[PDB]
Amino acid sequence: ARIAGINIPDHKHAVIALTSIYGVGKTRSKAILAAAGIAEDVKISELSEGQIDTLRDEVAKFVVEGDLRREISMSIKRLMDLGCYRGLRHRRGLPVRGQRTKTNARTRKGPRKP
Amino acid sequence: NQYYGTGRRKSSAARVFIKPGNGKIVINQRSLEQYFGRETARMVVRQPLELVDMVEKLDLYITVKGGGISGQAGAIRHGITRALMEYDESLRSELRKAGFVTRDARQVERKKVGLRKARRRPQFSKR
Amino acid sequence: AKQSMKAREVKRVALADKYFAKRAELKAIISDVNDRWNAVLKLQTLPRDSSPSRQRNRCRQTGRPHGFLRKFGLSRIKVREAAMRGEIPGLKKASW
Amino acid sequence: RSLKKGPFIDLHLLKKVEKAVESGDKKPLRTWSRRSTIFPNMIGLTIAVHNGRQHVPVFVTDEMVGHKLGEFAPTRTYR
Amino acid sequence: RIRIRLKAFDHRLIDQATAEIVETAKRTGAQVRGPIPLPTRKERFTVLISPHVNKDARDQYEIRTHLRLVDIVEPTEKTVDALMRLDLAAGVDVQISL
Amino acid sequence: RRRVIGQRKILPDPKFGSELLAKFVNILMVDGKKSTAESIVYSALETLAQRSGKSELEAFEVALENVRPTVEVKSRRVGGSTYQVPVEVRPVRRNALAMRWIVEAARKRGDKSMALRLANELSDAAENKGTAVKKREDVHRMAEANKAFA
RNA sequence: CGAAGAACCUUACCUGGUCUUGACAUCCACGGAAGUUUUCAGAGAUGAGAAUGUGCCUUCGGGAACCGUGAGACAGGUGC
RNA sequence: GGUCCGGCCGGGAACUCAAAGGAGACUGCCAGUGAUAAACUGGAGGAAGGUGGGGAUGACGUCAAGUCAUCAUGGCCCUUACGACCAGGGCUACACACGUGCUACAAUGGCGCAUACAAAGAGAAGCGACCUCGCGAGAGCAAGCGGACCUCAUAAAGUGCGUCGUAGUCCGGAUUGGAGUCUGCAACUCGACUCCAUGAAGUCGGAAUCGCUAGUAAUCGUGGAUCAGAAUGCCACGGUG
Numbered sequence A: 001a002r003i004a005g006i007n008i009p010d011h012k013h014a015v016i017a018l019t020s021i022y023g024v025g026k027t028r029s030k031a032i033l034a035a036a037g038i039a040e041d042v043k044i045s046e047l048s049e050g051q052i053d054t055l056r057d058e059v060a061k062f063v064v065e066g067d068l069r070r071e072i073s074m075s076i077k078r079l080m081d082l083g084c085y086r087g088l089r090h091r092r093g094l095p096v097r098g099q100r101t102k103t104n105a106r107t108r109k110g111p112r113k114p
Numbered sequence B: 001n002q003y004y005g006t007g008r009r010k011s012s013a014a015r016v017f018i019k020p021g022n023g024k025i026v027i028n029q030r031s032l033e034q035y036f037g038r039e040t041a042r043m044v045v046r047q048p049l050e051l052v053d054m055v056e057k058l059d060l061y062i063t064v065k066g067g068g069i070s071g072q073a074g075a076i077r078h079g080i081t082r083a084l085m086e087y088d089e090s091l092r093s094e095l096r097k098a099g100f101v102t103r104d105a106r107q108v109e110r111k112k113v114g115l116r117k118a119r120r121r122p123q124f125s126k127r
Numbered sequence C: 001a002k003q004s005m006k007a008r009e010v011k012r013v014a015l016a017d018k019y020f021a022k023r024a025e026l027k028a029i030i031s032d033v034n035d036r037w038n039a040v041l042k043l044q045t046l047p048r049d050s051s052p053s054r055q056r057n058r059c060r061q062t063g064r065p066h067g068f069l070r071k072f073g074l075s076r077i078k079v080r081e082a083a084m085r086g087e088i089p090g091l092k093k094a095s096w
Numbered sequence D: 001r002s003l004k005k006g007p008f009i010d011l012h013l014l015k016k017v018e019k020a021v022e023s024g025d026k027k028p029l030r031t032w033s034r035r036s037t038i039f040p041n042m043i044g045l046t047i048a049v050h051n052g053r054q055h056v057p058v059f060v061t062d063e064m065v066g067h068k069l070g071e072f073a074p075t076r077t078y079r
Numbered sequence E: 001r002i003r004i005r006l007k008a009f010d011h012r013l014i015d016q017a018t019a020e021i022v023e024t025a026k027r028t029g030a031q032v033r034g035p036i037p038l039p040t041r042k043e044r045f046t047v048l049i050s051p052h053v054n055k056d057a058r059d060q061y062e063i064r065t066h067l068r069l070v071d072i073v074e075p076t077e078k079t080v081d082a083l084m085r086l087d088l089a090a091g092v093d094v095q096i097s098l
Numbered sequence F: 001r002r003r004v005i006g007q008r009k010i011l012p013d014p015k016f017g018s019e020l021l022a023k024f025v026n027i028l029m030v031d032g033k034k035s036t037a038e039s040i041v042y043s044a045l046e047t048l049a050q051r052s053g054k055s056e057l058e059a060f061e062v063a064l065e066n067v068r069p070t071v072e073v074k075s076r077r078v079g080g081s082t083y084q085v086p087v088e089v090r091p092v093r094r095n096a097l098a099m100r101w102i103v104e105a106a107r108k109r110g111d112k113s114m115a116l117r118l119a120n121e122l123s124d125a126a127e128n129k130g131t132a133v134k135k136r137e138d139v140h141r142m143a144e145a146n147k148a149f150a
Numbered sequence G: 001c002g003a004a005g006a007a008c009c010u011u012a013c014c015u016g017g018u019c020u021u022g023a024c025a026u027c028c029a030c031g032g033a034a035g036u037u038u039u040c041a042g043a044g045a046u047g048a049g050a051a052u053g054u055g056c057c058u059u060c061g062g063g064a065a066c067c068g069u070g071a072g073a074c075a076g077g078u079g080c
Numbered sequence H: 001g002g003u004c005c006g007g008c009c010g011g012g013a014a015c016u017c018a019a020a021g022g023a024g025a026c027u028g029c030c031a032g033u034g035a036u037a038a039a040c041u042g043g044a045g046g047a048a049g050g051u052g053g054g055g056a057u058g059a060c061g062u063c064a065a066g067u068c069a070u071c072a073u074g075g076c077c078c079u080u081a082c083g084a085c086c087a088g089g090g091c092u093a094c095a096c097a098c099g100u101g102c103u104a105c106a107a108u109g110g111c112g113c114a115u116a117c118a119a120a121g122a123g124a125a126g127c128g129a130c131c132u133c134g135c136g137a138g139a140g141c142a143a144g145c146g147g148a149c150c151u152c153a154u155a156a157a158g159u160g161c162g163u164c165g166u167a168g169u170c171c172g173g174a175u176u177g178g179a180g181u182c183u184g185c186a187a188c189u190c191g192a193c194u195c196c197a198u199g200a201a202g203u204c205g206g207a208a209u210c211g212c213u214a215g216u217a218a219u220c221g222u223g224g225a226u227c228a229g230a231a232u233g234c235c236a237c238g239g240u241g
Helices: A014-020 A029-036 B069-087 B089-097 C013-021 C079-083 E011-024 E077-084 F019-028 F035-049 F057-064 F093-106 F114-126 F131-142
Strands: B003-009 B012-019 B025-027 B059-064 D045-050 D055-060 E002-004 E070-072
Touching: A014 A029, B003 B069, B012 B069, B059 B069, B069 B089, E011 E070, E011 E077, F019 F035, F019 F093, F035 F057, F035 F114, F057 F114, F093 F114, F093 F131, F114 F131
Parallel strands: B025 B059
Antiparallel strands: B003 B012, B012 B059, D045 D055, E002 E070
């Protein structure tokens, strides 16, 4: 499938190679090992690209690392500002979810100090 | 003809019958070793019948309504105490001499407000 | 807030069917997420004051709302008479 | 985030914006129901918020889509 | 199995009432049940009658409030009819309803 | 306190008829769960037996001989200051105390699983090397000696 | 903590908007049939309109359900 | 007794169960004890034993303590007032602690597949299965069920077979990238939970504030109300131990 990315698994077997890839759904990893489908013991180099080119057109529209570590930041833009929904809190450079999560931002954005 | 017993321990909720001869111990549809197979308490449920030579003379059939094997292992004890009490009056002495006759009723004057033991009265050698 | 909004609830509480819950039995079916007519709900939402299910309530046996025990139909302060006339049928010596 | 399934607005505010929106070289607006989400055609002019302590302007410039006006209302000196 | 849930304040009154059915609703049809009890409300009763606010005068009483199932296996009019003709015996609450 | 009501009676173990093996694992519990812990201690008496291929249960006593004490020291100030004065633990307290010293070593003692801690620690006990022997012997180096200062 | 929900909340309090017989409830004085439905205003209290309605005794008297405005008497709160 | 394999529906009264009226254990008779007093031990015999247990009532005397925020009322309140209508909001910061309450420090652990048994509860301002669409918080269809019928537990342990190999992880949810929701005028500078990416302190802390003696604290869960509602508070009985 010659999939886009930054990293490769090194000597580990299937069930841990497939999830030490730098952004691939571990809860999914179970069904996707049977999707292709391949054994739990494959040290990934024996897939010869072509025993995974077998799910190619599906993985050509999935978020695998290079998007989840970068290009997904272009997906927020139509929610991102003041107005209605989701928000300006993303643009402003803060923690997004925690209790009073604006207040968290000492390290994040400039202060560090209490 | 036949004999019977019932018990209430931890929290079974089980009965037993006795039938004339051939010496076995079933639980509705499976044998004893299938229902209690690793429960270290499995040994007592037949032990005062094997004494009085059950092998051709007595035979046993347990049924259940709160499975609860760590209580059932003794609920059956007072139950089979009842069954024997109409087969043989002589074993009232045996069952008593080895404890099998007893059932669960005793706390030891325990905690109600905070003092560990609470029946034993203030006590002296002259005051 | 003592006798209060009683004068405003009493004039529209009894019509919560006519405001919604029988007026809904044709037009409100389409109007749901399960049925997707996006035009519709937003033009039934205007009555604002009656708009059910909302009722400020009437604790009656207490002249003012020092709370109200919904399990029991009496105010939050009121329990002690029920040992002296039986209106809470498990009110006996405390569990502590 | 609890705007749970679709948009909503401060009603009493966007019902009265309409003459500021008509030829918007006109001076700012105000509001106190800080609950205040607003709409896309307030653009190129200035809403403001009772903060609560005082009032503060917030400029609907070119990009607004995304959060309540509560995003710029200084409510106690946050140290 | 239609469950006529007989009750009274006292044991004396529900006794007289079930004893008529177990015989008369049984006449040509069902083996009609009637002694078979429910969670019989043997509690303690306290109402204030203190003539002023002074010590106690909340005279504690006791109750029976005794309740049973009358059970009829079939509606069979040619056996049950005496229990519907028993309407005049107002003091026992019968809860036929099912 | 005048009544003779004091101690715990229990039943013996499920294989060999001793209150020793029952009470031993009935300290080792550390969290309750009794039945499977009694099955692990059975496996402990088998993993002891793998040292010879005979009845090594005959060596469970032989080991516990070096680990049963005589002394215990309790809270004592009766001459205006710390004054111990051991006095003996009774005939039944002898091996019941040894379990506590076997268990308090076993808890962290480093061997290959839960049985193989107690098998090896009762191996060491047999050879006088035991952690439980050393825990005993330290209260003998302490208390049993102050018998000449009492 | 009372608070078992200090962001409609049984309101402290910061206020602003009404009042001090006030929200609630009487005894006589002259009179009224009681309510359903939207439209525009208003932050809430409250403001300005448009239509649709007319019950029970029935001495045609006196009133009920039930709404009024005008009299003299006259209303309240955890304060320890 | 039939089986079309489900107490299914025939079929009858052993016992659990449900339970009303109620009932039976006393130094009773056996040995030792001493004054054949005392009573204390074991036991005939037992479902308890010397209040058999567990609830309970809680006298005068109760700290010059409360309930002074329903008390019940004598002495005394403010009344342009402490009287009554109605929309907003902000309590939580943060240096400081310090504790109450939470946990994370890995194999007497868990992790992955598969296997044996209880129930304490609350329940028409109700509780709702089967069954449809599901990554799931969460949608829909609706049998039912009023007090063993409906439902919410398919406690966690434990047991058989596999996988790590002592390894900061595989475990740490400190938390922060984005994604979503059940209500609401309402939660955002204010929550409550869900899906995937992750990963702040982490490796056994000293001194010295009292838990907890028995079927009792480690251990092993489930429920409830206030109330348009999210308590970790507390509250009560079960059980490996």
